[PDB]
Amino acid sequence: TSYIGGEGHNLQEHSVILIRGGRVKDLPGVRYHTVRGALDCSGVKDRKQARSKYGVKRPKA
Amino acid sequence: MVTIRLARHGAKKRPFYQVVVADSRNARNGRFIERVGFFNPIASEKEEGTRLDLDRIAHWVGQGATISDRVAALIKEVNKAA
Amino acid sequence: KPHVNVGTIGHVDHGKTTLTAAITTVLAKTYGGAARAFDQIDNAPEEKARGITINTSHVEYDTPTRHYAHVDCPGHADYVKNMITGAAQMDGAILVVAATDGPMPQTREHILLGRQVGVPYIIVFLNKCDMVDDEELLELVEMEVRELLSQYDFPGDDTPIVRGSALKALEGDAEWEAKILELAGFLDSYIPFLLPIEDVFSISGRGTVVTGRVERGIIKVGEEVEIVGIKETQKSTCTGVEMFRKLLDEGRAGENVGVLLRGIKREEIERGQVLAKPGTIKPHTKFESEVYILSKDEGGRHTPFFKGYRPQFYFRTTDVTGTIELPEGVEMVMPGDNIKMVVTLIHPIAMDDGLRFAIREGGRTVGAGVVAKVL
Amino acid sequence: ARYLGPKLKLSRREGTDLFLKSGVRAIDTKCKIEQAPGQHGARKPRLSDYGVQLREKQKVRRIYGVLERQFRNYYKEAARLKGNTGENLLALLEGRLDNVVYRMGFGATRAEARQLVSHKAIMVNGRVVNIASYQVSPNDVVSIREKAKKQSRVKAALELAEQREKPTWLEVDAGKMEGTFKRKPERSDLSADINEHLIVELYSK
Amino acid sequence: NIKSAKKRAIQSEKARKHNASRRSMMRTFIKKVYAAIEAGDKAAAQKAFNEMQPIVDRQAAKGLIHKNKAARHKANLTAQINKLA
RNA sequence: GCCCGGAUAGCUCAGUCGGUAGAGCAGGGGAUUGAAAAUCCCCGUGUCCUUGGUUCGAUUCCGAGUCCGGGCACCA
RNA sequence: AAUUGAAGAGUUUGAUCAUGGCUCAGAUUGAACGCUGGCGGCAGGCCUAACACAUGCAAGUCGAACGGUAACAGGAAGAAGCUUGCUUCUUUGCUGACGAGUGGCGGACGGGUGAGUAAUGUCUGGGAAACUGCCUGAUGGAGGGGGAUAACUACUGGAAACGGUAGCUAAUACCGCAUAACGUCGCAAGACCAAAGAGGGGGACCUUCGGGCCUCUUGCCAUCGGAUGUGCCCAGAUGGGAUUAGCUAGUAGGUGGGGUAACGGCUCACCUAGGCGACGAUCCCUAGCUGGUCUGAGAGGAUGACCAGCCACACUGGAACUGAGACACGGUCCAGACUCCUACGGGAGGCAGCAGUGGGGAAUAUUGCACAAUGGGCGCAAGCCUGAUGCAGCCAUGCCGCGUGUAUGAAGAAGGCCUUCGGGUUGUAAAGUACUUUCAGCGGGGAGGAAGGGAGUAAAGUUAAUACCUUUGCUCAUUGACGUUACCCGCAGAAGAAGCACCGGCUAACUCCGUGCCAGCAGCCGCGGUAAUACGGAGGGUGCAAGCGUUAAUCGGAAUUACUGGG
Ligand SMILES: Nc1nc2c(ncn2[C@@H]2O[C@H](COP(=O)(O)OP(=O)(O)O)[C@@H](O)[C@H]2O)c(=O)[nH]1
């Protein structure tokens, strides 16, 4: 079971995603991070800082 | 059959032939008994670029080993007499 | 070179194919180019588009200012599966009307089919003027075409109609030969490689081959071509072109070709997208479109729609449905308007101004549209 | 490669005139020196040991205009030489062509001197050299190529060298704009204020 | 397989039919000697020896045998008849 | 390219063979405390995926498209 | 001249010293992902499915081995147009050359994969009971005959694959005879065993007028050698588990027969009853090994991608022939599985060769060019073949170099942001102004990688000979995929080229506002309960740089497996 990070995601019962390791030491048993911005998991909204993570593209404007 | 052929070394567009004594039934840069000198066909106006110790060469051809035409022509260039 | 698709329409045996054999020869001698024989145009090789057997001859005639790819059908029913299904589309048609038959019912159906798919311009070619040689009967045939165009919502009051003889333009008699140049001249005055995706085929061992007739321009084996799809666009190259499993070194304008891509799956490309030129158009998520609405007796609707109504747009090969925003001032849109609508399609694609389409909803053609402004 | 940013701000980071903006106006005075590193620059830095060790290294990199990998490649060169690592680094860094032409006086600032080297204007041993990282050998002469000779830039820059130091590990002609490099430099005659001792242990870890 | 070096296929079949036919006659001459050694006739085997001594030696120069295998035959075969005589 | 099943308030389901949409698990808002457990006092928070037709009237009837999963093709 | 070389910090607790784990700072990677992106140089790029595979190509060559010549080009004889030699053109192996056939040679090299393998392998050091084509050294020989077969014809079975029937002819094909040696069997005496001719030129002579003969080049037979390759044996070393403790009966050895190139249980018949085993047998699991690569002060630990040597494999399993060498990637026979054609009787096929496709997967490239170069194959050579190799295309994957400009510029602006609202900061940053221009892009020049080879000529040897042939120079025309090359020059214009992580401590660098145990942050300790330097936005600063971060992986730190160096 993985940890879906981000402010409001879009994962519903299916849709292929990507899993990268790493514990959070906040939840018993979890050991991964679903990568935002991979295959089906879209980039989180309104995030202008640190966008390498969360898969957000560079703002066009 | 033992030959006195070459061996393409160096890089892309920058060769460095190793006049080597090897066997004809093997790779170009494969198993060799010895390397008798080297050859720099992409040399300059420096003081080197070709080295062939004749004694080691003659000992091989005298045994029954063949020489590559490229090496033999360069042997005429290295001039055993002059 | 800029390119416009053209075709000869009207009643069968009026002089469509010989007129097609008239323009291809007149532009090949006095200007230069390759000419196609009349029997080569009368007999049309078969093609399978979306599963339907279609016989369409692809000939070409070049003008000093415009590039033309012509299509033809020796069977009226073949013309039927051309425009509506999404096989052959022309921006400007050459209405072939015989002077001995005048506007026939079959000529009236071709005028009717021009309305639904959305053909903005219709050049009229009055043929068989070598029989009816009187001024009075030649003008009664002119007003019957113009009345058949004006009633069918076509600008028949200012359309240039070329009176001529197609068979006389074949042997090379200068009197009617230069008149076809006036016809070719009217194709230019009154009326960028792009390729639609009609069907894809994962050729066993070779890779993915996309099928589709060439819209504009010429391509050879090896050019880097981009593809605008209802996804994020990508780049690739045409490593090969074959037609009906027959080798082809060049994919030219008008020919139904088969493009072979460079490393793409079947899931990457879905039927409806387009292979465009790397540097001409970008995809848009928002744009404005102008539409004309039919009536209940010619299909259309019988009950109006409101805000949020999403009809299935059929732009050439695509069945993209999009929630349409209506302009301010109107609430209920009754069947028969000619107003503009705002489009926010669910999946972005190359939508530039001027693209024609026939709107559907539920299973019937509702209206004809054209992109007014790109946003 | 280059920093290409406000190349005087980092001089305010350490509070020392690193000659980054010599130009024609010798004394600046209007840059708010020593008191404008950032926005809240009024505060006194905690200055830890790792911090004092870093600034010593970070001072010199902004002076020669090189990067970390370039520097780590340079430091590795100092490790494989006898004598002393501390001097092996600084002797190497003076071998840079853009440093040599700057020391000859043909360059006002190193940034300006770097441009003439990169644009084939400089000529060593009668040969055109593009890469500024050209490790010059001792007992060699440099000169300015004829077509790019006296093109207004070296003229203004040459007289600005008359407010300078005029070192001893090199030699200039200044008659035909010619400079000749002698043996590699000693520490005792290079600025006298850049400590290399603190640099060495930083790359041990 | 589709390769012009399929002649080596028919070359070998022509050769195997040939070679083995020679080896079969080579072996039976050796067997004939063992018949006399079984019966203990020192005179018969002696003649049988020189009967095909050149034969087994003949395939040596032909290239069928490794020539040392053939030489090994003439050694022990003699050893049997000298044991008998 | 074609044929079906799920698309019912956060979640899982009832309700239909036209009649103005429910329940359960919820969760939360207020009073108490340094903050909660506990107790008392009130609860739908729904575009039935969207849209169109047959309309006194459609979640349910016939239609389409899109998303998801499951079956079949076709081979420039 | 040839290892000048070793760092720490946070967290147990009210607080402390230890013991002790956990974690972080570093380096690296055959990488993947996310965002961003200007070019170039050199390498590298299927690690999972040893998964199944469409099509193209990846090994042929020699006429100086032979019969022939089906084709293409000449010669010659002839014949028809008609311009009477300008053409047309039927015969013809008579030359050049050459599909198909017989034969010599290669196909066992080169190239790919790592499934299997824990010792039948590899590595290290020795050894004797072997063999060894092509090449080379020494000494002799190279005499003489016979009969079949393919191609080619006639006929004929089969859809095709693929043959069959009665006949034809030659050869460096094949089989006998002759002759033997320092060769082989044998104590000796004795006995026995080999083969092949072609190409060029030409004088006297000789022409059944094919040619012989002299001679030059080369090939063939045998023997001892040599170089090289290959096979075999012993010893040491080469992973983990004892919660794997007995294993083995051709197994331990001997004699004899047989077999192998060679020794041998390699294999048999018989006799004896031993052999391996705690310094670890057998069994199970895993796995190509090494020279190396990465880390590490070293010792060591991990690992075995590219390159190089070696072994194994070639759809699965097995077997065997040919041959110097295979018990064989593009060879055969069989069983089996999976595809393919079918005229349903029967046959055809193996990308772990380079490309490419499906599928797998987080993920790894064109169905490109040339044989110019190096090497290999055949050949006298010329040449021909060569997906080896040399190059190009694709990707920031890595290392490395360069550019995105410079100097000047204070109302120290606008606007953003903070403010004790004075101002400070952004900020020499920009604008403005003066110059230069790498690399892009456009247009012309222009290295080098090319050695030779081919033809001709002179000379020197060979010889009866100025011939032929061979060798040392020289002349002519030159053979370049890359290739719009490397490099150089000219022109225009700052024009076309900067993002990424972070800012409580470890750890370099800050505030405001918004959200209020909510949302989210997070490697560890830990932040958030309505005033957060740790969440989110914004300004500023810091770290790095065409890369920056993240996850996984390995080592280090870890003296937390301690031999160096612990209890
Ligand atoms: N009299 C006359 N007949 C014409 C003219 N043009 C065409 N036609 C006739 O029309 C016939 C067919 O014309 P076409 O357009 O090829 O018909 P389709 O190919 O069957 O549709 C031919 O037989 C022509 O004789 C014309 O100008 N004058």
Ligand SMILES: *C(=O)[C@@H](N)Cc1ccccc1
């Ligand atoms: C492949 O043949 C295409 N060029 C034309 C086509 C033929 C049949 C069906 C679809 C495309």
